[PDB]
Structures are given as structure tokens and as C-alpha cells.
Design a protein around this ligand. Sequence first.
Ligand code: BX4
Ligand code: BX4
Ligand code: ZN
Length: 257
Amino acid sequence: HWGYGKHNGPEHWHKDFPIAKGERQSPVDIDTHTAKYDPSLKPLSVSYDQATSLRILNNGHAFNVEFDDSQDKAVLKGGPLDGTYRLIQFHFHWGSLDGQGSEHTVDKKKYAAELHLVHWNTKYGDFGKAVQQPDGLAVLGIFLKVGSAKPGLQKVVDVLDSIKTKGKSADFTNFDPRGLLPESLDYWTYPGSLTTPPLLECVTWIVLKEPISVSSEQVLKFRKLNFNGEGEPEELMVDNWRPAQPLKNRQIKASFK
Ligand SMILES: Nc1cccc(-c2ccc(S(N)(=O)=O)cc2)c1
Ligand SMILES: Nc1cccc(-c2ccc(S(N)(=O)=O)cc2)c1
Ligand SMILES: [Zn+2]
């Protein structure tokens, strides 16, 4: 099926998912000089104190740290958003080399990786219903650069050997995603899509201006994961990013001057 190889990668997706060529596809390049400060945008409200992580899953495309989203426990509010969005999972996209890996770019700059914290609008009742709505999801995107280690990432890094291959999962309780955030919550925002099939146009993207730093050793461990299942030829899980898509009729707004 779809993936990130020569024969099933982003340039092929449109054949099964025609929305791939749609009017509000993600990711995009963030042209910092063209993005307009919007003084009406509110500070983001990230409320993760009551988060309940449950499990970590290798799904053959990335790994997901999954949360209990059966109550308002970890929520994103404010910013460009109307209402309350519940954290369901986070995952990353990363490269084979430090010079690539991010999905969004900033003045064409690629970062080593990009963290996506995925939230759904509670007015739609559950995640499956939310992805069918133009304002169904809010994804908080955070860039990763290689430098000093991120101590809050280490618990994630250390469990990866137990979920090496597609379909493997492991208990992953009491993980605090606040340890993955940068200091500043300054952001860019625009209407877009899921960045993998089914590529649904249901996402308010909120991309933080400040990257987090992770160590070379941390990202090297991401790169030891496998796209393949157990007992299949090893294909390293690297370069699981979609490149920038046309902005078309969209404006990127900045929360900051
Ligand atoms: N080589 C090969 C064999 C069988 C199926 C495929 C394949 C399957 C799905 C897609 S896609 N990206 O979903 O359109 C692209 C390629 C590719
Ligand atoms: N299979 C499936 C079903 C529903 C949603 C998704 C999904 C969710 C989030 C994202 S992303 N990478 O955060 O934009 C991409 C795809 C994937
Ligand atoms: Zn993602």
C-alpha cells in the first residue's frame, strides 16, 4: 500500500487518494516574510497536566504515543481555535540525515524532524467523526533540530527497541508530553490537511516558531525503527515525511510580531 518508498511514496498517493491534489493540502512552506501578524489571535492554551498516556505503537509509517481521550484530560484551546480539542496521540516525522525530516519548512529550511501533537474537536464526539469536518482536528507541530538532548524525549527513545517493527506496541503509561515543548508558544497557523493518507482536509495547523533541540543519539534511535513487520526484510523507518504542497488560496497567520 502507500508509504514513503520510490514505488509507493508521496508522488503516488493521488492515485488512491485524489484529495492529494486538493485546495488545502499539508504540509506547506512557511514564508516568514509573507506570513501576517494577526493581533486578534489569542495565546495558545496547552493544558496537559492531566494527560494519561497509554501505549506506544509502530504503525508501519511512524510511531504513535496514544492517550486516553475519553475525557477532557489533555486539551488544546485558544489560539485560532474555537472550542476544545482533546489530545489523542503524538508522533514524529524524521529524516535519514540531519538536514531533512520535517514536513513543514521555514523559508525553505528543513529541520531534522517534526513532532505532531494530534487533537480532535470535542463538538464532534469522536476522532473518526472529527476527521470528516473542516475544523475537526488541531495539530500542534514542533520542529526538532540536532544539538543538545531533550531530556523529556528520552523515555520515548528508550522504548523504541521494543516496537522495532510494524504492528508492535508496548505499554507506555505516565509519559508527560509537556517535556516535549519549547519555551515559547509563538506560532504560525493555517488551514490544511492530514499529511498522510487519507489526506483529509480537516486540520487547523498550529506550528511553533521555536524548535526543540534533540541530540544526535536521540534521532539516531528513531532511525533504527523499521517500516517492515517482524520476519520481513529490514527497511529502516527514515524519511517518513511528505514534502511541501502548494499553498494555493491560503494565508499563513503569525501570532507574533
Ligand atoms: N509496487 C507496488 C505493488 C503493489 C502496490 C503498490 C502501491 C499501492 C498503493 C499506492 S498509493 N500511494 O496508495 O497510490 C501506490 C503503490 C506498489
Ligand atoms: N489512518 C489515519 C486515520 C485518521 C487520521 C490519520 C492521520 C492523523 C494525523 C496525521 S498528521 N501527520 O498528524 O497530519 C496524518 C494522518 C491517519
Ligand atoms: Zn504527522
